[PDB]
Paper text:
The small 3-O-sulfated galactose head group of sulfatides, an abundant glycosphingolipid class, poses the (sphinx-like) riddle on involvement of glycan bridging by tissue lectins (sugar code). As an attractive possibility, the concept of the sugar code considers the glycan part of glycosphingolipids as a biochemical message anchored in the membrane, and thereby presented on its surface ready for being ‘read’ by receptors (Gabius and Roth, 2017; Kaltner et al., 2019). Like the glycosphingolipids, known endogenous receptors for their glycan part (lectins) present their own mysteries (Ledeen et al., 2018). Especially the occurrence of diverse types of modular architecture is not yet fully understood in functional terms. As illustrated in the bottom part of Figure 1 for vertebrate galectins, three distinct forms are found (García Caballero et al., 2020; Kaltner et al., 2017).
Respective testing disclosed aggregation also for Gal-8 (bottom, left). The two tandem-repeat-type galectins thus appear to use a compensatory contact for acquiring stability, and here sphingosine's hydroxyl group comes into play as a possibility. A means to test the validity of this hypothesis is crystallographic study, if a complex of a galectin CRD with synthetic sulfatide-1 could be obtained. Clear electron density for the head group structure was obtained, whereas the amide's acyl chain appeared rather mobile, so that a profiling of the head group's contacts became possible. As depicted in Figure 4A on two levels of magnification, the galactose moiety with its sulfate was central to contact building. In this position, sphingosine's hydroxyl group and side chains of Arg69/Glu89, together with a water molecule, are connected by hydrogen bonding. It hereby appears to functionally substitute the 3′-hydroxyl group of the glucose part of lactose. The data obtained by crystallography with the synthetic head group are first evidence that a non-glycan determinant, here sphingosine's hydroxyl group, is involved in sulfatide pairing with a galectin via water-mediated contacts, as the 3-OH group of glucose of the canonical ligand lactose otherwise does by direct hydrogen bonding. Structurally, sulfatide recognition by galectin-8 is shown to involve sphingosine's OH group as substitute for the 3′-hydroxyl of glucose of lactose.
Numbering used by the authors: 5 to 160
The structure:
């Protein structure tokens, strides 16, 4: 409900960048982009740091996959080992279609909407205060990355 504040337009992919502010409850991450016609998958990762080796922990891996029926895989990476996947089969992403992802950080979970329709929840596995880095990888065109805040949904 606050005005969007974009940090970057048209970032080169893979993108890695520092998040300006701590992801307190009510924070919104807003990502606009387009799925190329040949995309197999892309991901948005909320990371504890940016190291590639040992690979930084990923508090929240949000991973649309386009083969077969399509799905979104969510998971957490700790010390270079993935945990148990949570798979959402009702996916709104399609090759050759554009999207607006809104990741809402709540007290107990992430709530993700795409094109304004609720898509999935992911309970926190590590504290969101450990997140300082946003990564975007794979086959995706990103138009903008920005941050907002909602006091309404801040406590729910
Ligand atoms: C098709 C592959 C598999 O199931 C496993 C798990 O596949 C991983 O699944 C994770 C989410 O659980 C990440 O998506 C990850 O991708 S990564 O580039 O972020 O590291 C991806 O390989 N793969 C193996 C045994 O080799």
């Amino acid at each position: 409900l606050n005005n969007l504040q974009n940090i970057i337009y048209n970032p080169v992919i893979p993108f890695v960048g520092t998040i300006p502010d701590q992801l307190d409850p009510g924070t919104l991450i807003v990502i606009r982009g387009h799925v190329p016609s040949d995309a197999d998958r892309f991901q948005v990762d909320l990371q504890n740091g940016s190291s590639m080796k040992p690979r930084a922990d990923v508090a929240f891996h949000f991973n649309p996959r386009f083969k077969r029926a399509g799905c979104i895989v969510c998971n957490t990476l700790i010390n270079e080992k993935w945990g148990r996947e949570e798979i959402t089969y009702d996916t709104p992403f399609k090759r050759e279609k554009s999207f607006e992802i809104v990741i809402m950080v709540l007290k107990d979970k992430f709530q993700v909407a795409v094109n304004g329709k609720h898509t999935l929840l992911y309970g926190h596995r590590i504290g969101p205060e450990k997140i300082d880095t946003l990564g975007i990888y794979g086959k995706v065109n990103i138009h903008s990355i920005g941050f907002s805040f909602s006091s309404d949904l801040q406590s729910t």
